[PDB]
Amino acid sequence: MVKIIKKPKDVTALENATVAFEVSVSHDTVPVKWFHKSVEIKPSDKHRLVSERKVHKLMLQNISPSDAGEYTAVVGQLECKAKLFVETLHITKTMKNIEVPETKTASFECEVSHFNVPSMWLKNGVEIEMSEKFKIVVQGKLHQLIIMNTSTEDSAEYTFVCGNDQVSATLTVTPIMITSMLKDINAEEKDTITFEVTVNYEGISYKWLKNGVEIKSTDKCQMRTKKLTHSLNIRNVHFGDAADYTFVAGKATSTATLYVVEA
């Protein structure tokens, strides 16, 4: 006269979750057994068997992928079955190897299987910390690493760790090259002059030096960019302006001299 009333249902859960299967019967104090892979389940640190009047539960704690599969409750000669599906954290979109000119920004992105995966980024196997240099971003299932102001030292293999999965890609930081170098300028007192250089990449950072000292942007000394050309325009030149000028971008430099003929 014992009847199964409510049968166990499939469970889908993340690895490391605690889950349960439940069978209910028509009578109090009916003994039950549970099976997985054709072996009877015993109480353990992983498995808890709880009977409460008509309700019988199998609880599985801290599940691993090996716990996946079909579980059977046996009540007399009556049986019922349900399955556990264990979702694991994994990569769903990989990262791209990239080449980035020095001084420019590099970025890596991947996509993962689940929300709320913690950020974990490595550079050559060593954990990276968020800083002004490294921007670490999560946007739902999208994970991004932004590397500012790249230099040779940033060329490396970068890895995102996602549970027991990981994905890697390489950054190669490429050298700025000067395709048209500075030329000397031979000027007269009160002239306005313009030094010009052309480089191979747009969007690079640079500075200008006067006898090795960084020049301040002023009305007199204007520094501008047009496409791949960078200029230093000096108004109303005098003897004090006669000097060696250097354009610097990344590891690339070009130097020329301004001559100013007086009076």
Numbering used by the authors: 3 to 265
Lines from the paper:
Residue T2850 is located at the C-terminal loop region of the Ig fold. To study whether this region is involved in interactions with the next Ig domain packed serially along the chain and, thus, whether the T2850I exchange influences the Ig-tandem architecture of titin, we determined the crystal structure of I9–I11 (comprising I10 in its poly-domain context) to 1.53 Å resolution. Three molecular copies were obtained in two space groups that agreed in showing I9–I11 in an extended conformation. Such extended arrangements are common in titin Ig-tandems. In I9–I11, the component domains follow a regular arrangement, where domains display relative torsion angles of 45°–68° and are connected by short, two-residue sequences (TL and PI, respectively). In each Ig-pair, the domain interface is consistently formed by the A'B β-turn of the N-terminal domain slotting between the BC and FG loops of the C-terminal domain. Here, domains interact directly through a limited number of contacts (section S2). Both I9–I10 and I10–I11 interfaces consist of a central hydrophobic residue contributed by the linker sequence (TL; PI), flanked by two polar interactions between loop residues from the neighbouring domains (inset). Residue T2850 is buried within the I10–I11 interface (burial fraction of side chain is 0.79 as calculated with FoldX). Here, T2850 preserves its intradomain hydrogen bonds (to T2897 and E2849) observed in the isolated I10 structure and, in addition, hydrogen bonds with S2952 from the BC loop of I11. This suggests that the exchange of the T2850 residue will cause a local alteration of the conformational dynamics of the titin chain.
